[PDB]
Amino acid sequence: TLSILVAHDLQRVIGFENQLPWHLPNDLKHVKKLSTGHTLVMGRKTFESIGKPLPNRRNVVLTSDTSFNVEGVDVIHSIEDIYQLPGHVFIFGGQTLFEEMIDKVDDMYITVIEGKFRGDTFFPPYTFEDWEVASSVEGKLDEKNTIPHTFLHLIRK
Numbered sequence: 001t002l003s004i005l006v007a008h009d010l011q012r013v014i015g016f017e018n019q020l021p022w023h024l025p026n027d028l029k030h031v032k033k034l035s036t037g038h039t040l041v042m043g044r045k046t047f048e049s050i051g052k053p054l055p056n057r058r059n060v061v062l063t064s065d066t067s068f069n070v071e072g073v074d075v076i077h078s079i080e081d082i083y084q085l086p087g088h089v090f091i092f093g094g095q096t097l098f099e100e101m102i103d104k105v106d107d108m109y110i111t112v113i114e115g116k117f118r119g120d121t122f123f124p125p126y127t128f129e130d131w132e133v134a135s136s137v138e139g140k141l142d143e144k145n146t147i148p149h150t151f152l153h154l155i156r157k
């Protein structure tokens, strides 16, 4: 399987100044559970906004930088290399990678953040005419998770 994994708001904002605009522990747990034991593919900027690979899964970074070498990170230099990675692969961000991959993935795991944030990076537009709703699960609000959010699993029709 080739999947997208993304959290976006009502206007498809995914980022602001190389950070996420929201803090939602429930969504981070969601990411952890889906991707532990599998593969994350991300653009260079997304990786550098964290600077350390996520434990207990393969972290793949796409960059043109032939000098890129980070301990615990595998590097690729072409979109075409993504198709050679084994197992379940998750396109993890950012805007550029989403734009390049949205037409290619089998399915999408989307956390819809039910708010409107200031952003400078966006998930590309998509229509539910192209995607079946495999599941739609309301996130639980509480002390530490105070923005309404819905976990969607979308599969290409």
Ligand SMILES: NC(=O)C1=CN([C@@H]2O[C@H](COP(=O)(O)OP(=O)(O)OC[C@H]3O[C@@H](n4cnc5c(N)ncnc54)[C@H](OP(=O)(O)O)[C@@H]3O)[C@@H](O)[C@H]2O)C=CC1
Pocket: 005, 006, 007, 008, 013, 014, 015, 016, 017, 018, 019, 020, 042, 043, 044, 045, 046, 047, 049, 062, 063, 064, 065, 077, 078, 079, 092, 093, 094, 095, 096, 097, 098, 100, 121
């Ligand atoms: N809300 C969410 O779920 C998520 C949000 N984000 C956010 O997204 C933002 C970053 O997005 P964006 O600026 O688009 O950056 P990206 O993370 O997509 O990185 C862009 C870089 O990736 C590399 N790259 C992309 N395509 C190719 C290619 N075909 N060949 C070689 N290298 C390639 C290039 O690296 P190089 O220049 O080194 O060659 C390029 O400059 C941040 O704000 C981050 O917070 C990210 C993931 C998820």
Ligand SMILES: COc1cc(-c2c(C)cccc2C)cc([C@H](C)C#Cc2c(C)nc(N)nc2N)c1
Pocket: 005, 006, 007, 020, 027, 028, 031, 032, 042, 046, 047, 049, 050, 051, 052, 053, 054, 059, 091, 092, 093, 109, 110, 111
């Ligand atoms: C090391 O590469 C990364 C690690 C993390 C990271 C996570 C997910 C949890 C705890 C700590 C860290 C550092 C995040 C990212 C990017 C910003 C992303 C993302 C994302 C999120 C947050 N939610 C949904 N649904 N999809 C997503 N792609 C990259």
